[PDB]
Design an enzyme around this catalytic site. Structure first.
Site, short mmCIF file in Angstrom:
data_model
loop_
_atom_site.label_atom_id
_atom_site.label_comp_id
_atom_site.label_asym_id
_atom_site.label_seq_id
_atom_site.Cartn_x
_atom_site.Cartn_y
_atom_site.Cartn_z
N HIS A 61 64.72 21.56 3.47
CA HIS A 61 63.87 20.83 2.71
C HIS A 61 64.37 19.47 2.41
O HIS A 61 63.53 18.49 2.13
CB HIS A 61 63.36 21.50 1.23
CG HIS A 61 64.44 21.88 0.65
ND1 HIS A 61 65.31 21.20 -0.39
CD2 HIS A 61 64.94 23.32 0.49
CE1 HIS A 61 66.10 22.16 -0.89
NE2 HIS A 61 66.19 23.49 -0.36
N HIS A 91 70.92 14.36 -2.84
CA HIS A 91 69.97 14.63 -1.76
C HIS A 91 69.03 13.48 -2.03
O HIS A 91 68.84 12.85 -2.84
CB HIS A 91 69.52 15.94 -1.84
CG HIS A 91 68.54 16.18 -3.31
ND1 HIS A 91 69.13 16.72 -4.26
CD2 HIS A 91 67.21 15.97 -3.51
CE1 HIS A 91 68.44 16.75 -5.03
NE2 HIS A 91 67.21 16.36 -4.88
N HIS A 93 64.70 12.37 -1.16
CA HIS A 93 63.18 12.78 -0.87
C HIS A 93 62.74 11.29 -0.31
O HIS A 93 63.01 10.38 -0.63
CB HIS A 93 62.39 13.04 -1.97
CG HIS A 93 63.09 14.09 -2.80
ND1 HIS A 93 62.63 15.62 -2.62
CD2 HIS A 93 64.00 14.34 -3.71
CE1 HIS A 93 63.26 16.28 -3.35
NE2 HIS A 93 64.05 15.45 -4.03
N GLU A 103 59.53 10.71 -5.55
CA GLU A 103 58.81 11.47 -6.54
C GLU A 103 58.34 10.92 -7.64
O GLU A 103 57.01 10.93 -8.05
CB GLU A 103 59.96 12.70 -6.63
CG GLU A 103 60.39 13.23 -5.45
CD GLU A 103 60.82 14.72 -5.49
OE1 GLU A 103 61.72 14.98 -6.35
OE2 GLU A 103 60.05 15.69 -4.87
N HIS A 116 68.60 11.57 -5.60
CA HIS A 116 68.90 12.36 -6.67
C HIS A 116 70.26 12.81 -6.56
O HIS A 116 70.82 13.39 -5.54
CB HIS A 116 68.04 13.51 -6.61
CG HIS A 116 66.55 13.36 -6.76
ND1 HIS A 116 65.39 14.13 -6.62
CD2 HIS A 116 66.04 12.36 -7.56
CE1 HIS A 116 64.35 13.54 -7.05
NE2 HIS A 116 64.68 12.64 -7.58
N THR A 195 62.37 19.40 -9.28
CA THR A 195 61.30 19.22 -8.34
C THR A 195 61.13 20.01 -7.14
O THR A 195 60.08 19.63 -6.58
CB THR A 195 61.21 17.73 -8.13
OG1 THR A 195 62.00 17.38 -6.78
CG2 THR A 195 61.44 16.68 -9.21
N1 LIG Z 1 64.83 27.88 -1.32
C1 LIG Z 1 65.88 26.92 -1.98
C2 LIG Z 1 66.98 27.04 -1.44
C3 LIG Z 1 68.19 26.59 -2.33
N2 LIG Z 1 67.61 26.02 -3.55
C4 LIG Z 1 67.12 27.15 -4.71
C5 LIG Z 1 67.23 28.51 -4.24
C6 LIG Z 1 65.96 29.18 -5.28
C7 LIG Z 1 64.49 28.91 -4.91
C8 LIG Z 1 63.72 29.53 -5.72
C9 LIG Z 1 63.95 30.53 -6.58
C10 LIG Z 1 65.13 30.81 -7.09
C11 LIG Z 1 66.33 30.07 -6.35
C12 LIG Z 1 68.23 24.80 -4.03
C13 LIG Z 1 69.41 25.34 -4.95
O1 LIG Z 1 69.96 26.63 -4.86
N3 LIG Z 1 70.18 24.38 -6.09
C14 LIG Z 1 69.56 23.18 -6.14
C15 LIG Z 1 68.54 23.40 -7.07
C16 LIG Z 1 67.74 21.85 -7.41
C17 LIG Z 1 68.88 20.68 -7.64
C18 LIG Z 1 67.98 19.57 -7.86
C19 LIG Z 1 66.47 19.44 -7.79
S1 LIG Z 1 65.93 17.70 -8.14
N4 LIG Z 1 64.87 17.60 -6.74
O2 LIG Z 1 67.00 16.83 -8.08
O3 LIG Z 1 65.22 18.11 -9.22
C20 LIG Z 1 65.93 20.52 -7.46
C21 LIG Z 1 66.49 21.76 -7.32
C22 LIG Z 1 71.31 25.22 -6.90
C23 LIG Z 1 70.84 26.54 -7.67
C24 LIG Z 1 71.92 27.30 -8.16
C25 LIG Z 1 71.62 28.25 -9.01
C26 LIG Z 1 70.29 28.49 -9.17
F1 LIG Z 1 70.10 29.60 -9.88
C27 LIG Z 1 69.26 27.91 -8.56
C28 LIG Z 1 69.67 26.62 -7.87
ZN LIG Z 2 65.38 16.13 -5.64
#
Ligand SMILES: NCCCN(CCc1ccccc1)CC(=O)N(CCc1ccc(S(N)(=O)=O)cc1)Cc1ccc(F)cc1
Ligand SMILES: [Zn+2]
Length: 257
Positions: A61, A91, A93, A103, A116, A195
């Site tokens: 993504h 990262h 967008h 965003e 971000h 987001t």
């Molecule tokens: N399919 C997506 C693969 C991985 N994705 C989430 C996985 C996921 C998906 C649905 C349900 C549960 C989990 C990213 C991930 O893992 N991050 C980053 C999270 C994040 C940081 C900043 C922004 S932003 N754009 O700056 O607002 C948005 C999101 C660390 C983390 C560590 C522990 C957690 F419990 C959750 C997130």
């Molecule tokens: Zn972001």
């Protein structure tokens, strides 16, 4: 399953993540005339001198640069924040065209991209625990406009050809994120959310007023990345932004008059 296409994009996310219709979702439009100067806000403290970058990654993504957050190296403090927040990753967008991609918006204006820098509150010990807290994360958001090149971004742009598709990673050591910051740390702040899924309502947003300029050649390299994994139909990683969400019962505060 989720993504940014017609059948799996932001209008669908609420089915798997019902908080998508919650009370403090992000991003939001920043109405500059309604944001109130808050003289009690402290200056932001961005202390990145000891940052240790590790890898650059295509996660299907966005692309992200990851940092060693095992120690208080690169930290965000001050501003609206209580305590110390460690830099985990940054990262972007971005859009298919220069007129969209951010965003957050400013008086409904969309920028070409948004950076971000993601930080987590060390009082919660690890990022997984921090995402379960209303003050768990602080994300520093920086707008990108297209104009002059950003020299400090070029080392990022030049390695993207090596992480074209989902899952691909590469060593990305000794990258200095201070090279991505604008001159001014004037900012807007409000309580919001991740987001992307899981859209957790755990983020203090700190959005810088001053954009950075990047060149058309730099952003065009963003647009060559792929959402898909290698060997799948090529779907360009463009327009990986969530649109502005309802502000609801929130006030956006400005650090500056
Ligand atoms: N399919 C997506 C693969 C991985 N994705 C989430 C996985 C996921 C998906 C649905 C349900 C549960 C989990 C990213 C991930 O893992 N991050 C980053 C999270 C994040 C940081 C900043 C922004 S932003 N754009 O700056 O607002 C948005 C999101 C660390 C983390 C560590 C522990 C957690 F419990 C959750 C997130
Ligand atoms: Zn972001």
């Amino acid at each position: 399953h989720w993504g940014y296409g017609k059948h799996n994009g932001p209008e669908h996310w609420h089915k798997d993540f019902p908080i998508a219709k919650g009370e403090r979702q992000s991003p939001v439009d920043i109405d500059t005339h309604t944001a109130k100067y808050d003289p009690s806000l402290k200056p932001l403290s961005v202390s990145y001198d000891q940052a240790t970058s590790l890898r650059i990654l295509n996660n299907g993504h966005s692309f992200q640069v990851t940092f060693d957050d095992s120690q208080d190296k690169a930290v965000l403090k001050g501003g609206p924040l209580d305590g110390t927040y460690r830099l985990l990753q940054f990262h972007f967008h971005w859009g298919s065209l220069d007129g969209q991609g951010s965003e957050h918006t400013v008086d409904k204006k969309k920028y070409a991209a948004e950076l971000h820098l993601v930080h987590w509150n060390t009082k919660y010990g690890d990022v997984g625990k921090a995402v379960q807290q209303p003050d768990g994360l602080a994300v520093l958001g920086i707008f990108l406009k297209v104009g002059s090149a950003k020299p400090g971004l070029q080392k990022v742009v030049d390695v993207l050809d090596s992480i074209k598709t989902e899952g691909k990673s590469a060593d990305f050591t000794n990258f200095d994120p201070r090279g991505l910051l604008p001159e001014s740390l004037d900012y807007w702040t409000y309580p919001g959310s991740l987001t992307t899924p899981p859209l957790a309502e755990c983020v203090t947003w700190i959005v810088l007023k001053e954009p950075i300029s990047v060149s058309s050649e730099q952003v065009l390299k963003f647009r060559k990345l792929n959402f898909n994994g290698e060997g799948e139909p090529e779907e360009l990683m463009v327009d990986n932004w969530r649109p502005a969400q309802p502000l609801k019962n929130r006030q956006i505060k400005a650090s500056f008059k």
